[PDB]
Symmetry: C4
Subunit: 291 residues, 4 copies
């Protein structure tokens, strides 16, 4: 049993091609992902090499930086750094027609330099994360007189997410009248799918009624169709004053028949009502007798 | 009677944990909240203690700043300030291999320095506020032949909010067939929940009909379930050319049975039609006779 | 007959209060509206006064700018300009403990200076406009066998608006069973309210059927209720790769009973199919005979 | 047979007018479209011709730049470049009342200069692209016992698009009871129009049932009405942490009656499950016998 969706809801499918690419994915399309400290290294790195190059560029021009040593790389490099940052001390003024032309070019570079560098930082850099915890398991047990598929999520930060949508989706292999076998998605209807203010915990619920794609199914039948469940969550995070997304996926064998999530809200001596996420993945079962 | 939601719709529940944190909540996740004047202080402060440091850094290098006094902090500090701002007067040029290397590092810093500082300012700094006033009370009284749960809201600014949604929500403790007591959310249907152009005042209305979760309830029964009402409002503000959110919460004892909001629109000698928010929280009751 | 909504769908109602204000409406809440050329003046202006002040600040410190004339404002001012821009020529270096402290403060100022100035520009400055033309009139005439309320809109730019929503809304004075007279909004159902790709012209249509709030109404009855129609349009503009909004309002006497918009699409010798907005406000009527 | 919508869903219709323009379309309304390398040229170019100008401006003032040659353009130009970038070496200080006034003006320019330049870059520059491939053809064939209009789309990048909407739309010429011929849009209902996580491939499907605008139509009848199909796709791209849009259009003769898309998912020796976009446009037909 290989898994079509990973737990984080990434696709396992291998992709085939080697030709074109996202314009701007990389001309984030193709930096704004890797960790903060790394990001800085890269910009730092790029900052140096760029300078050390213009440095190399002045030298190959001659002894054309005043008050500089003959053909010295450090002196020049620092003049470069001193040109690009736009520090312009003066002691190291340019010389002639050429050096000066590299100057105005080098200034331009550090200017855009700064802009791009600003864009990234803001882009990140923004992309905020949702701090949403999904339960490691699902359960099917009775609620309001129906067997109900359930799972739950928690908000890991103190800030509030408002206008929160969850979508719970069955994915499985089906056969058509026409004898074609395909992979189909079903949007399980939830007792409730919109929570206007998500702040603590949320048990999402699919009553398996006669209208449910999983009516009359069992573990065995679910495994036969290699059924999986995909959960997508979204919301506007008060913290970032921005939007957030989280996904997660579950396979059949992560569905506990009969289970009940343990209550996650507590009452305490200090602070009264509380919420203990230590219990978030806890599920109760009734264990049957042996002989 | 302790309150589960505060008037501002913040949650009263105590949260339990002490382990992880929002990546970027603080690496706004963890500044862009505190007041303008404060923000400036902080950046000002940071600006100083970063300079003073590099200052300390040059000194611990030796008498390595030219035209500077021996081991003087002020002179150096100013050279720092003069390096980071990228002012580069020149009179205070760096000395040797080391100082110069701190320089290029210090320039980088003030560069990102500027970018971050720009990001924050724009981030704020944006997050605009909705200037929405909620009535201090709710009422239940007859409209179009049904008892109706009502409350109202007003736009506190001259700008217009377009595409405005309100969601009015009953939260209460219920018992399931299976003898489990939980807290449930109901979306009260509104005679109208979308207002395409919100500009003045808006009375939001829940006709308590047979389909209403509060059909046949009374003050007594509402208190019994510790019922609360949560209101979320959102919209695109023409002002900021951006989105806005406001919430508020009400308990049972802020529902006035029989009350009628007072009309808030006026006709006047000058300007004709007007709107008086002075009367926004005013509610009419019929008082019954004593003996 | 005074008008409750203006043609541009602004509210005519006078607003009453004089106490609080939008935090950031103005601390755009309270610049990013006035025209480009004006914007520049203001920043230019602000740029000068700020400098001329720090100038005044150095002087009141003494003859503390080197190579400057005694107590001269121009010299100082230029040193200020030379400090704030972070030009730092050098010929005009600061003097002592105090001047230098104004320096680091002045640099900070021009830094934020630049950031704010950047934020605004981007904010504007963004807020893009929709170039949407609304017809000066509405018409009620027969379409598909029903009298139909209609009006139309055109896209004034070459770019495309995608995902376009229009909302057409009756506003009028009504009376409740309970003898209260209020102003009510009705969302007229449109044959079609979503146009996924708005690019040329769009006649929006409300079939007055038995379900319509304006079933059996007439000019006379519409005027009695001081009925108005409010139109809100929104969409994502391909141009700005951003969102856009437009509104407009119509009173009774801008509804032409019997009228038909003139066809606005043409066929031509050159370019074949065309679209002539010169005809956009043209309406056909049948004029009855005299004696 | 001329085509009303092109394959990319641009409109073929000629537009008529020559009077007003988008405020900011160009005052992106009217730069942020042309290719990266080009963009840089333009800013580079602009950077130069703004400097050369101020250069010309100083000269026409006299020999007013110190340490500069008499009336030399290069020297001045570089002083310009050295003023605008805010490099401020010093060796080339300004002279008198006038030069200095051009200075503070030139600094302002390079300041806004930088801000605008930063805005554009971020604006671009953002507008991210969707990397969505549409099948070159449509098909009508039986699925679940109904003839079904189908086509499919694929994600060309490794990143995921979440909350993806597709809208498939019949456009054709119709005649009203009132003998008026117009162009009408129909929203074909899809067996599924929202895909919460689009990542690989998606066959979009319109079961032609009794409720379908294309019930009982044929190639002949479709051509008669000059029917076209328009597809709009949108989604939030995880990559850019932003939104994306793609459209495409199809005419009658790009609908293959009886065809079946070839399965695009594969199983392999290495990596097991894969997806081959090489087969994306492949369609199966049953070819009938000759004599
Ligand atoms: Cl499907
Ligand atoms: Cl209403
Ligand atoms: K400088
Ligand atoms: K200098
Ligand atoms: K500088
Ligand atoms: K300088
Ligand atoms: K000097």
């Amino acid at each position: 049993k290989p898994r079509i969706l990973n737990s984080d809801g990434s696709s396992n499918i291998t992709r085939l091609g080697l030709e074109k690419r996202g314009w701007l994915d990389d001309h984030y399309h193709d930096l704004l992902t890797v960790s903060w400290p790394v990001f800085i290294t890269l910009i730092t790195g790029l900052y140096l090499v760029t300078n050390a190059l213009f440095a190399l560029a002045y030298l190959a021009c001659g002894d054309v930086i005043e008050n500089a040593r003959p053909g010295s790389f450090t002196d020049a490099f620092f003049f470069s750094v001193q040109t690009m940052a736009t520090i312009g001390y003066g002691k190291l003024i340019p010389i002639g027609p050429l050096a000066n032309t590299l100057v105005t070019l080098e200034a331009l570079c550090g200017m855009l330099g700064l802009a791009v560098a600003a864009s990234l930082i803001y882009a990140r850099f923004t992309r905020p994360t949702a701090g949403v915890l999904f339960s490691s398991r699902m359960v099917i047990s009775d609620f309001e007189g129906k067997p109900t598929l359930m799972m739950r999520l928690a908000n890991l930060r103190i800030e509030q997410i408002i206008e929160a949508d969850v979508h719970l989706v069955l994915v499985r292999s089906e056969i058509s009248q026409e004898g074609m076998v395909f992979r189909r998605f079903h949007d399980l209807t939830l007792t409730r799918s919109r929570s206007p203010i998500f702040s603590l915990s949320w048990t999402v619920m699919h009553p398996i009624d006669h209208h449910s794609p999983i009516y009359g199914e069992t573990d065995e039948t679910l495994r036969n169709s290699h059924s999986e469940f995909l959960v997508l969550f979204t919301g506007h995070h008060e913290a970032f004053a921005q939007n957030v997304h989280a996904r997660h996926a579950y396979s059949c064998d992560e569905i506990i028949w009969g289970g009940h999530f343990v209550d996650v809200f507590t009452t305490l001596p200090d602070g009264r009502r509380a919420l203990d996420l230590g219990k978030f993945h806890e599920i109760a079962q009734h264990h049957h007798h042996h002989h």
